[PDB]
Amino acid sequence: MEKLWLNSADSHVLEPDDLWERALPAALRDRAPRCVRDNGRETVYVDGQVVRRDPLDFADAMRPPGALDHHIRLKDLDDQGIWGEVVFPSRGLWTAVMTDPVLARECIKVYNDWLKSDFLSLSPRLVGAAMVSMLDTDDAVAELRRAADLGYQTVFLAATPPPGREFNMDVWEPLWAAAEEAGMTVSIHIGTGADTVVARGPGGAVINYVETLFPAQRAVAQLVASGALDRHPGLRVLIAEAGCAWVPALADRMDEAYRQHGMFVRPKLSMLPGELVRRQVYASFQHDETAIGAVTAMNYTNVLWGSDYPHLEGTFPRTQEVVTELFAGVDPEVRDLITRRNFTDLFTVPALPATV
Amino acid sequence: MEKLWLNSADSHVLEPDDLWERALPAALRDRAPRCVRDNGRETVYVDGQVVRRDPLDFADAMRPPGALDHHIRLKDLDDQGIWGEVVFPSRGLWTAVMTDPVLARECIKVYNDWLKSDFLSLSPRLVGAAMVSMLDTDDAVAELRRAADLGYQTVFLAATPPPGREFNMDVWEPLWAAAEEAGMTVSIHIGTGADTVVARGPGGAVINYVETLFPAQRAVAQLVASGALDRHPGLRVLIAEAGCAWVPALADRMDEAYRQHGMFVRPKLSMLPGELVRRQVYASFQHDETAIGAVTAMNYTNVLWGSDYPHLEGTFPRTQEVVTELFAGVDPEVRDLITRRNFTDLFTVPALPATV
Ligand SMILES: CC(C)(COP(=O)(O)O)[C@@H](O)C(=O)NCCC(=O)NCCSC(=O)[C@]1(C)CCC[C@@]2(C)[C@@H]3[C@@H]4C[C@@H]5C[C@]3(C[C@]5(C)O4)[C@H](O)C[C@@H]21
Ligand SMILES: [Mn+2]
Ligand SMILES: [Mn+2]
Ligand SMILES: [Mn+2]
Ligand SMILES: [Mn+2]
Ligand SMILES: [Mn+2]
Ligand SMILES: [Mn+2]
Ligand SMILES: [Mn+2]
């Protein structure tokens, strides 16, 4: 009966089961990501490897219908009061754990074409993330430039890059130049790329959810400390689904090492790590009240709200109730920044009509 | 009050070069930490392994005369306007990378004996951290109890425990119980238990200072998610030298897993992860402005200042210039909580007339 319009910096689409089977040549078509949900488990096959074997809860973790039917998804946007929404891959994310650059490149093209033709075509409120090869810089630059020509506003990078392709390495430089030139936002989504750590013991569910942060913090440390962002002032990076309050914490950690350990520090930066973070690093959250304190108390203005539809850790179907609780008693300019404006700085959707 | 009088939750004592040479059984003597100073490098040997190599400029920058001479240390405390100070090991920290429980147990006993008898005895302004075995719970419990009887107020644990001895494991339960029974604070100091040189490419120095956070965040997640803090309401944990504003960020991350991933969460907790963190998890910093933000906007009141005397990361010798600028225009109550009062909740030193 009373809702506030929001924009969302994070959600996922479920690709068609046969997306890659139907579109790839026979040398490639059997090796592309395949999800099986059977007998209370999700199994993912990539290029002859079991990359996931996760329990499901057939009772208490049932997927929203709109995950399975894109017309129910658009009703859910209106019901939740979300206008614009960034859309990341689901099965497509598994291209980041591929070792074959050819399988990666061709699976990425297929995904970027399907997403635009068949999904983004449903509404210009949908802002797609184009995948680019995590394995090969020439392949990555080619696909970013092709995606830019198709109208994509952001590329997805996995939080854990392949071995020897850390984000501080020179191998990425041409992608940073190409992203800056095209004005593409680089969106680094957590929980993607090779597994780094899996908790097995007591508290595993909570520990595993924390462990997915460390690749995101490391990626920010790598981009800032390496001068990648310093050399590319127009390059903006969105850390998707990692929360926000650690970002000013990391700025202060990097400034302390930069100033106190300066005799070990190479390269030199034109400005402090914390200044590059506050200028170019954005982060999304779903429920975290601390994201608001980062803005009001830590001069970190690059916070974006995200629904993370249709994941358990997102807000659905209580988006409006969550955002009411979050912003009870908060300056409406801060609500406007976090829920609408940062989104429209990074992304272009059609004009949100006014309500009076 | 020409000075702002502070308590320091973090500093280090450099052990006598011959501490272990003289005190250990003959069979163990050669295996204890020892160093060679040649070319312009200090090399540290532990039990048949090179654990650390440093240029002498960096090695000796951490060794102003107060780092060695405890009489000069007390003068430097007065000069810096610091009253109470927690003192952590330097060479003793290498017990956390030993693989032999007997060698670790005996080296720890030698350290704890020297520290109380020859260092802590000069002033009640000094609060020592007793080491306890990282390798064997019975050894760790016996030494915590012995150290308590000697009047120790805190024990040091390494941030990266040995493989299979993660902090969520049942093996630690007897130690949590002994620490709670004795009123002993558990102090986890970052950059211990593991090699700190992880990154070697561009931005390496800044990246490595960030990587030391990941074991600290993992440790808090393990202690919260396992129920170790929930089962021991009297147990307080100090995370030393990791900064502060990531702690409330982690509180929110764990609350989101707890609530949205509840069907996968074991054990259940008597209160939310964020309530355990705000009740029992303390954290120190030297320079970080975001630490004040965590208190004023994220309801995280467990923030302690530390000089980290005499490390480069710390404020020495500009302690008054740093804390004056940090707390310029800050609520005196908040300045008092962070610089004085959390210190005296954890640790007992003679009370200043806060008359001033
Ligand atoms: C520049 C590189 C990347 C080398 O690159 P290249 O191979 O030349 O490409 C590398 O040398 C570097 O990162 N240098 C900065 C100095 C440093 O080692 N940073 C580690 C992270 S900071 C750290 O680990 C603290 C927590 C803070 C500084 C003091 C620290 C190293 C102390 C020092 C040294 C040693 C280790 C120790 C206890 C000890 C007895 O005093 C703690 O375990 C840990 C601690
Ligand atoms: Mn997401
Ligand atoms: Mn998600
Ligand atoms: Mn949910
Ligand atoms: Mn000698
Ligand atoms: Mn320290
Ligand atoms: Mn230090
Ligand atoms: Mn310093």
Q: If you search the block for the tokens 């026979």, which residue do you land on? A: A26
Q: Please state whether beta strands A34-38 and A126-131 pair in parallel, antiparallel, or not at all (unpaired).
A: unpaired
> For chain A, how many residues are written?
356
B325 CA → ligand 1 middle, Å: 27
Q: Does B196 touch chain A (CB under 8 A)?
A: no
Query: How far away, in angstroms, is A110 Cα from ligand 6 center?
Result: 52
Task: Report the distance separating Cα A66 and Cα A311, nearest Å.
Answer: 11
Q: Are A93 and A35 in contact (CB under 8 A)?
A: no
Stated in angstroms to one decimal place, the resolution of this structure is 1.9
Asked if residues A67 and A91 have their Cβ atoms less than 8 Å apart, the reply is: no
- How many helices (H) and strands (E) are present in chain B, helices listed first? 17, 11
Alpha helices by DSSP H, chain B: 19-23, 26-29, 56-61, 65-68, 70-80, 101-114, 137-149, 173-182, 204-211, 213-225, 228-231, 246-260, 273-280, 290-297, 319-327, 332-336, 342-346
Q: Of A127, A241, A149, which Cα lies nearest the Cα of A190?
A: A241
Q: Is there a contact between A270 and A230 (Cβ–Cβ < 8 Å)?
A: yes
* CA proximity to A220, closest of A197, A268, A179, A186: A186
The DSSP symbol for B337 reads I
Closest chain B residue by Cα to residue A293: B297
Ligand nearest to the CA of B199: 1
> Quick one: three-class SS letters along chain A?
CCCCCEEECCEECCCCCCHHHHHCCCCCCCCCCEEEEECCEEEEEECCEEEEEEECCCCCCCCCHHHHCHHHHHHHHHHHCEEEEEEECCHHHHHHHCCCHHHHHHHHHHHHHHHHHHHHHHCCCEEEEEECCCCCHHHHHHHHHHHHHHCCCEEEEECCCCCCCCCCCHHHHHHHHHHHHHCCEEEEECCCCCCCCCCCCCCHHHHHHHHCHHHHHHHHHHHHHCCHHHHCCCCCEEEECCCCCHHHHHHHHHHHHHHHCCCCCCCCCCCCHHHHHHHHEEEEECCCCHHHHHHHHCCCCCEEECCCECCCCCCCCCHHHHHHHHHCCCCHHHHHHHHHHHHHHHCCCCCCCCCC
d(CA B14, CA B288): 25
Q: Is B231 left (phi over 0), alpha (psi -120 to 50) or beta?
A: alpha
**Do the Cβ atoms of A168 and B266 come within 8 Å?**
no
Bridge partners of B351? none
Establish whether B320 is an annotated binding residue.
no
Cα Rg for chain B, rounded, in angstroms? 20
d(CA B242, CA B283): 7
- What is the rounded distance in angstroms from the CA atom of residue A189 to the CA atom of residue A192? 7
List Cβ neighbours of A213 (8 Å cut-off, separation of 6 or more): A190, A242, A243, A246, B217, B250, B253
Q: Which of A205, A188, A213 is nearest to A312 (CA)?
A: A205
Q: Which residue's C-alpha comes closest to atom 23 of ligand 1?
A: B191
One-letter amino acid identity for B22?
R
| Dist. CA B234–CA B211, nearest whole Å | 30
Query: For chain A, how far is it from start to end, CA to CA, in angstroms?
Result: 16
**Beta-carbon contacts of residue B329 (< 8 Å; ≥ 6 apart):** none
Residue in chain A lying closest to B219 (CA): A207
- The answer to whether residues B106 and B133 touch, using CB atoms and an 8 Å cutoff, is no
Hey, are the CB atoms on A293 and B290 less than 8 Å from each other?
no
**Beta-bridge partners for B100:** none
Q: Are A245 and B252 in contact (CB under 8 A)?
A: yes
Q: Which ligand is nearest the CA of B12, by number?
A: 6
Burial of B50 (0-12, 13-18, 19+ CB in 10 A): exposed
Q: Which of A201, A266, A292 sits opposite B166 (nearest CB)?
A: A201
Q: Which of B246, B275, B277, B331 to mutate to test the interface with A (most CBs of A within 10 A)?
A: B246
State yes or no: cis peptide before A267, omega within 30 of 0: yes
> Is residue B287 annotated as involved in ligand binding?
no
Tell me how far CA of residue B279 lies from CA of B119, B180, B235, in angstroms.
Answer: 32, 14, 10
Those residues whose C-beta lies under 8 Å from the C-beta of residue B70, and which sit 6 or more positions away, are: B13, B118, B119, B122
Q: A263: Cβ below 6 Å to ligand 1? A: no
Q: How far apart are CA B58 and CA B41, in angstroms?
A: 9
- A311 marked as part of a ligand binding site: yes
8 Å CB contact between B9 and B343: yes
Q: Rounded CA gap, B70 and B122, in Å?
A: 8
Distance B169 CA to ligand 5 centre (A): 41
Q: Which of A59, A203, A273 sits opposite B225 (nearest CB)?
A: A203
H/E segment holding residue B201: none
Which atom of ligand 1 is closest in space to residue B311's alpha carbon? 29
Q: Using CA atoms, how far apart are residues B108 and B10, in angstroms rounded to an integer?
A: 20
Q: CA separation (Å) from A222 to A7, A177, A260, B202?
A: 29, 16, 18, 8
Say which residue the tokens 């779903």 belong to: A286
Tell me if chain B has a CB within 8 Å of the CB of A222: yes
B211 has a chain A CB within 8 A of its CB: yes
For chain B, the first-to-last Cα distance in angstroms comes to 7
The Cα A210–Cα A216 span in angstroms is 11
B159 CA distance to ligand 6 centroid (A)? 12
Burial class (CB in 10 A: 0-12, 13-18, 19+), A144: buried
Q: Indicate the pairing of strand B154-158 with strand A303-305.
A: unpaired
- Inter-residue contact A230 to A269 (CB < 8 Å): yes
d(CA B268, CA B37): 53
Is the Cα torsion angle B103, B108, B114, B117 positive or negative in sign? negative
DSSP-derived secondary structure letter, B226: T
Alpha carbons B79 and B319: distance in angstroms, whole number = 9
Give the three-class secondary structure for B54: strand
Q: Which tokens go with B164?
A: 């299979």
- Can you tell me the distance from the alpha carbon of B263 to that of A225, in angstroms, rounded to the nearest whole number? 39
DSSP B88: B
Residue B30 Cα distances to B20, B24, B50, angstroms: 9, 9, 13
CA angle, B11 as apex, B6 and B17 as ends, to 5°? 145
